[PDB]
Amino acid sequence: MNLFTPRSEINPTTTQELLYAYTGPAPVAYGTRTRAVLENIIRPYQYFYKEPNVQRALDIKTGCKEPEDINVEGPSSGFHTASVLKLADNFFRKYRPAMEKLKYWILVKLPKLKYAELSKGRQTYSFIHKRNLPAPIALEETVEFLEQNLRRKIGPTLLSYCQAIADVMELDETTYEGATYTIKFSREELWDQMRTLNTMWKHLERGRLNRRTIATPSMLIRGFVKIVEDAAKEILENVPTSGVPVGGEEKLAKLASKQTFHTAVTGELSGDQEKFNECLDPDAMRLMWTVFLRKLGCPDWIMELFNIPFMVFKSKLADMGEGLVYTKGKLTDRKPLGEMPSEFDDLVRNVVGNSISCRLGMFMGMYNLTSTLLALISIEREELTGSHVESSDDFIHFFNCKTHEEMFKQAETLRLTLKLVGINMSPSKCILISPAGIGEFNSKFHHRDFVGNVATELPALVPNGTNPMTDLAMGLNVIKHSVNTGQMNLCTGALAMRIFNHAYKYAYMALGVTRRTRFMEENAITPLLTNQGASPVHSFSTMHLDEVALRRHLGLLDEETLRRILNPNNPVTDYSVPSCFKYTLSR
Amino acid sequence: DHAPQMRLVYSVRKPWPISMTPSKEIPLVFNGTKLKDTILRTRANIVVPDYWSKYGSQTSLEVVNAILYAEDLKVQRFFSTEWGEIRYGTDNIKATIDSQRD
Amino acid sequence: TDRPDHIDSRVWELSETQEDWITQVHGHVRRVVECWKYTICCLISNMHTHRGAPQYDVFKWQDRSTIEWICSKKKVQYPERDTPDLYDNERAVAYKVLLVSDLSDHSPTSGIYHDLAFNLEGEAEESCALVLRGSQLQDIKGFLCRALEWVVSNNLTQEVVETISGEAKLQFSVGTTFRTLLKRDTDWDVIPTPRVEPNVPRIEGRRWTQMKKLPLLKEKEGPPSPWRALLLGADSEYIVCPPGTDQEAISWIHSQSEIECIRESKSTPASVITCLTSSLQSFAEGNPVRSRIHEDIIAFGINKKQEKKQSASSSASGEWKRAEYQVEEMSLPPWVEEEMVLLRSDQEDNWIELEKNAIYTEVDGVAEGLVDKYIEIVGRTKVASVIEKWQIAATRTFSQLHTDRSRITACPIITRDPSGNCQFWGMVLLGPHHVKRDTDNAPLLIAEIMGEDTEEKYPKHSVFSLKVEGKQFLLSLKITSFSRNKLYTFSNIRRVLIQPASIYSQVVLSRAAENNSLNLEVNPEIQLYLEGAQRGMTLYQWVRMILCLEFLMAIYNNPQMEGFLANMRRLHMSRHAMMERRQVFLPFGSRPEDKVNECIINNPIVAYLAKGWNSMPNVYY
RNA sequence: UUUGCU
RNA sequence: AGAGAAAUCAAG
Ligand SMILES: [Mg+2]
Structure with a gap:
């Protein structure tokens, strides 16, 4: 580790890039996820009261509590209603133009949203076929079920789809005829299918010792989630305290550039949030949204539309999974919770078939932007006279006070406000440097006026697998995006180009002695393109140009070969030219 | 869409990777190499595009320029650009109103 | 009641006497949008002469007698209600400028005049891209962007949207049974209205304690970890x-x-x-x-899983217990x-044979030179x-x-x-x-x-x-x-070459910037915390050792390494801050060394890194 | 399923 | 036997 600590030429901050082993395989979760899911579901209830009383907390519907019950020493699971209201009001007042842009989006853009984009989601669990399916298939079958049970035609707009869902929720019995079976749902069964969340291992997650799961909602409630998340994105992109989803370059550099009169105490606090998703209450988020919309003069139906998904999540049913593992000396058996004593027996009362019903806490990957907004509203107070940037979990705060006592008071106030809204900053992962100038945030390491952007995942410098021209264009585009983003300078950019070029040439049998090279040698077919074996034509300053045009401008391609390979009548067939090499693979 | 990324090496090395519409221009067997498969869109080996670049029906030069015009513009712009030393470290309304008055 | 800054004074004064804005709902907004329409017409009509006469004639806010006289001069007639805003003589076509929230909602309407439809964001209908020129579209887009900025800055979005488009309708509703289902696991209704006075209390917090010395990582005891990688490492031969x-x-x-x-x-x-x-x-x-x-x-x-199944079944006399797993410490x-x-x-042959790119610019030449020197450094x-x-x-x-x-x-x-x-x-x-x-x-x-x-x-x-x-x-x-x-x-394990390349390039470029001249054939001395006999090493040896350690980390990457590095970045930053005579302060009950020590169990490379950290000083004066 | 990335 | 880490593969 001392090898990564240079103290002569560069700083340890510069070598922060050496503390990533992403060039190796990412850990993959193994076996049943029931233990992790149950731990995530139970964490909120233990933290609700200062002394863990899970049985008492399991009866609490809304996770609101008084400031006395807020734990200033360990994680807290609830929120303060009055504090949330006042903080939301302050946030609305301070960023009024952002709220006006949100109003413009609601009045103009929201009604014209199409639910076709709803087919871009993750693997959805079909409440008809009872298994995970690709998003387009689940959307298709759900829409067909809606048409069958409503005797009407769902409009192309997302609002129409949500209204259709709300209407079909009014039928005591619903039927789906599909080839040929007739699935019948009662109102309670369809409600359970709508509110049930499906948990899945978050495969290929780095920087974590323990694997954690994520949740996906049913296709029935995905429209409301999309509406709410789009509104959250619209409000966030116009707020200077947000680090997502837009580029963090400007966000982090803007605060790094700021200075003072060399007389005020300046501090930089970098931190993360402990159990971020296992402490937030959907009720707090929907209350914040209601405050925003009401102070914005929005109509009642908009407020109902925004609130519905949060209530549905509040009445969720988390899928337990395969079950907890029990041994019999040397055997192994996965059994559902409640069959035998375990660590989560307190939750046995909440078991509903193979699903566990929980009210507090959240699951990762569902309401990211709303969670970020909730974190942001809590920073708008009179005491907190300092800059703040937050990305879901990570956060960086800049304090500019008159004395160290004021700075520490402001830091503690920030911690306590985050507790107030239901977010606990991990004390072990929060570090404050004074004077300011050194910090870390969203894998960007800032030192004085140099912000080193370190990629969280090194680019997979290999062809995408579509076809030679498309693959080359996409790979060069990826390298250029990584370079101009600051994650790779000129030398490492050229090195990445060389590595990708070697991999790309190998993938198409153009490097050594293969069938392709043998054929081109026997028939004296000179290699004129990179995928054929020709020396690379792109460079550091020419990753945005097409191979064919660039070669033609350089004379490396002649009119005869150009007319031969670009002929549209060739029986073979992103800004790559449609040449004869733009073929398609069989399977 | 990581599956195509991992499958490329095996996909290309398969016996009949390329899937192409049947055609008579491509010879069935050229100099000992069986380029096409007679069973249906048919299949062909990766050497077919290389073969086309040497023995293929040429389209008109005008077609070539039209297809390449968009990208050739960017190439010309870059090579015509000049790179400096590298460092280390109201009237419209008036006309309308006057015209209306006229 | 004042004039928006993006509307010219003359247009405002003219519109002042065109309609009874006072008796019209949202009169100010109506007048403002009409002024926008007039300004759009003017932008269309500016500096465009056909056969010595203006190419565009504006009928907007002009007397009916004059408008009819002009139309008769052109052998055309329009009603009072359906009076086009503009007339293009070159195209001899009447146009009626229109503003719409969304362009798709627009329709051609009647055939008396082609509708020039635009949205508040400056975009125009696909038909407008034909009739109007590029400069006209750019000017209109800029003006409408300014108008939208004024709208948002004055909280008039709803009024404008109503004026141009119409009135919003009830696009969503929920029945009573769905409301009953929703109100099952929450104390509030669909629209939460908790009647409590908004106020943030003042909670009693804790004190932030200073980190005077860096922490020490926990070195585990037990059997030495054996080689667990897929293939061999330094002991590889051919x-x-x-x-x-x-x-x-x-x-x-x-x-x-x-x-x-x-x-x-x-x-x-x-x-x-x-x-x-x-x-x-x-x-x-x-x-x-x-x-x-x-x-x-x-x-x-082969056929081993069933063998273990049978063996365990034959000797499973007992009662079920929760499956507890234990990672053997080493x-x-x-x-x-x-x-x-x-x-x-050192080797004889260079084992990194990557083709060079095509140098065109001086920047490309510098990049290729840096990469070539790096390959020379670590190739053999x-x-x-x-x-x-x-x-x-x-x-x-x-x-x-x-x-x-x-x-x-x-x-x-x-x-x-x-x-x-x-x-x-x-x-x-x-x-x-x-x-x-x-x-x-x-x-x-x-x-x-x-x-x-x-x-x-x-x-x-x-x-x-x-x-x-x-x-x-x-x-x-x-x-x-x-x-x-x-x-x-x-x-594709070849990607391990990027990080040491990044460090080497950063050092070389820092030297070049300090001297304003790129001297590729340079290797300064990188002072480090070493065993004690030596106080540093040249850049090339340091880069080689970085490459070796990075390869070992990649070969031994696993959850322990991931967590160890993720939680060690914090301590690296803290050490850097202490080096610069900064002060590191921590919240109550903070121990980053605990988050690091959680991930020191089996990995030999993690143990190597932890020992290296412990070897370094933990106090700075 | 035939095998050549320093 | 083995890979591995909180529990899966070692066929179905
Ligand atoms: Mg952080």
């Missing part, structure tokens, strides 16, 4: 064979070979060697695939330092050879995992020197795999040529003695089960 194809080299190896077991491992019995030679022979005679043999049963765990083994020393040993090292070996082995083994197969497949590890001589690092035999998922662990029998054997380092390997042309070699056999994803990741 047999030199005459130039030729893989089959020819394997036939040459098989012809002159006396494989005899030197050290049998009870985890990989020596008998399994028969499964290797049989494949080696099979690959020699053309086909790499091969039918199973008796020994294969114990080589790839200490730092002494072979990590030896591996690091050996990995940076054993770590590069091991990286090439790992890449070739992973690629050859992963290329055979895309189909279900019940027969043994042989995937040799052969690399060719620039003189063409083959180099046999070893072989990988793929047992019968029937992959139905991706991450399923395929069974492998990995034979590798090893330079030196240590029982404490390779407890599960079986070491045999190979003899070729008199020369003696050691051959280690390991029965492994490896995931497809890891094999694919290692198929």
Whole structure:
């Protein structure tokens, strides 16, 4: 580790890039996820009261509590209603133009949203076929079920789809005829299918010792989630305290550039949030949204539309999974919770078939932007006279006070406000440097006026697998995006180009002695393109140009070969030219 | 869409990777190499595009320029650009109103 | 009641006497949008003369007598209600400017005039891109952007949207039963209205304690960790064979070979060697695939899961208990330092042969020069050879995992020197795999040529003695089960070259910027915290050691390493801050060293990094 | 299923 | 036997 600590030429901050082993395989979760899911579901209830009383907390519907019950020493699971209201009001007042842009989006853009984009989601669990399916298939079958049970035609707009869902929720019995079976749902069964969340291992997650799961909602409630998340994105992109989803370059550099009169105490606090998703209450988020919309003069139906998904999540049913593992000396058996004593027996009362019903806490990957907004509203107070940037979990705060006592008071106030809204900053992962100038945030390491952007995942410098021209264009585009983003300078950019070029040439049998090279040698077919074996034509300053045009401008391609390979009548067939090499693979 | 990324090496090395519409221009067997498969869109080996670049029906030069015009513009712009030393470290309304008055 | 800054004074004053805005709902907004329409017409009409006369004639806010006179001059007639805003003489067509929230909602309407439809964001209807020029569209877009900025800055979005589009309608509603279902797990209604006075209380917090000294990581006790990577590292060797194809080299190896077991491992019995030679022979005679043999049963765990099932069932007399797992703690083994020393040993050939890019600009030349110098620095090292070996082995083994197969497949590890001589690092035999998922662990029998054997380092390997042309070699056999994803990741293990390249380039460019001249042939002294005799090293040696350590980390990447590095970045930053005479302050009950120590269990590379951290000073003055 | 990335 | 880490593969 001392090898990564240079103290002569560069700083340890510069070598922060050496503390990533992403060039190796990412850990993959193994076996049943029931233990992790149950731990995530139970964490909120233990933290609700200062002394863990899970049985008492399991009866609490809304996770609101008084400031006395807020734990200033360990994680807290609830929120303060009055504090949330006042903080939301302050946030609305301070960023009024952002709220006006949100109003413009609601009045103009929201009604014209199409639910076709709803087919871009993750693997959805079909409440008809009872298994995970690709998003387009689940959307298709759900829409067909809606048409069958409503005797009407769902409009192309997302609002129409949500209204259709709300209407079909009014039928005591619903039927789906599909080839040929007739699935019948009662109102309670369809409600359970709508509110049930499906948990899945978050495969290929780095920087974590323990694997954690994520949740996906049913296709029935995905429209409301999309509406709410789009509104959250619209409000966030116009707020200077947000680090997502837009580029963090400007966000982090803007605060790094700021200075003072060399007389005020300046501090930089970098931190993360402990159990971020296992402490937030959907009720707090929907209350914040209601405050925003009401102070914005929005109509009642908009407020109902925004609130519905949060209530549905509040009445969720988390899928337990395969079950907890029990041994019999040397055997192994996965059994559902409640069959035998375990660590989560307190939750046995909440078991509903193979699903566990929980009210507090959240699951990762569902309401990211709303969670970020909730974190942001809590920073708008009179005491907190300092800059703040937050990305879901990570956060960086800049304090500019008159004395160290004021700075520490402001830091503690920030911690306590985050507790107030239901977010606990991990004390072990929060570090404050004074004077300011050194910090870390969203894998960007800032030192004085140099912000080193370190990629969280090194680019997979290999062809995408579509076809030679498309693959080359996409790979060069990826390298250029990584370079101009600051994650790779000129030398490492050229090195990445060389590595990708070697991999790309190998993938198409153009490097050594293969069938392709043998054929081109026997028939004296000179290699004129990179995928054929020709020396690379792109460079550091020419990753945005097409191979064919660039070669033609350089004379490396002649009119005869150009007319031969670009002929549209060739029986073979992103800004790559449609040449004869733009073929398609069989399977 | 990581599956195509991992499958490329095996996909290309398969016996009949390329899937192409049947055609008579491509010879069935050229100099000992069986380029096409007679069973249906048919299949062909990766050497077919290389073969086309040497023995293929040429389209008109005008077609070539039209297809390449968009990208050739960017190439010309870059090579015509000049790179400096590298460092280390109201009237419209008036006309309308006057015209209306006229 | 004032004039918006983006509307000219003359237009405002003119519109003041055109309509009874006071008696119109949202009169100010109506007047403002009408002024926008007039200004759009003016932008269209500016500096456009047809045959010496204006190309566009504006009928907006002009007397009906004059408008009708102009229309008669053009032999056209329009009603009072459907009076077009503009008339293009060149095109001899009447137009009626329109503003709409969304362009798609617009319709052609009647045929008396083509509708120039635009949205508040400055975009125009697809038809407008034809009639109007590029400059006209750009000017209108800029003006409407300014107008939208004024709208948002004055909280008039709803009024404008109502004025141009119409009135919003009830686009959503929920029945009583759905409301009943929703109000099942919450104290509030669909629209939460908790009647409580908004106010943020003042909670009693804690004090932020200063971190005066850096923490010490916990070094675990226990058996030294053995080599657990897929292939070998510094102990990798190869047999030199005459130039030729893989089959020819394997036939040459098989012809002159006396494989005899030197050290049998009870985890990989020596008998399994028969499964290797049989494949080696099979690959020699053309086909790499091969039918199973008796020994294969114990080589790839054939019909083993059922065996354990039956064995456990026969002796399971008891009661069920919660499955508790325990990771066996292990200490730092002494072979990590030896591996690091050996990995940076100089070689003869350069093992990083990557083609150069096409230098066009001076920047391209500088980048290629930096990359070439880096390749020269790290090219002739054993770590590069091991990286090439790992890449070739992973690629050859992963290329055979895309189909279900019940027969043994042989995937040799052969690399060719620039003189063409083959180099046999070893072989990988793929047992019968029937992959139905991706991450399923395929069974492998990995034979590798090893330079030196240590029982404490390779407890599960079986070491045999190979003899070729008199020369003696050691051959280690390991029965492994490896995931497809890891094999694919290692198929491009060449990416390990980027991080040390980044550090080297950063150092060189920092020197160049300090001197304003790029001197590529430079290697300064990087002062570090070393054993004590030496206080630093040149840039090239430092880069080589960084490459070796990064390769080891990549080969030993796993959840422990991930967590250790993720939680060690914080302590690295804290040390850097302490170096610059800054103060590090922590919240109540904070111990980052706990988050780091959580991830020090088995990994030998993590233990090496932790020991290196402990060696450094923890107090700065 | 035939095998050549320093 | 083995890979591995909180529990899966070692066929179905
Ligand atoms: Mg952070």
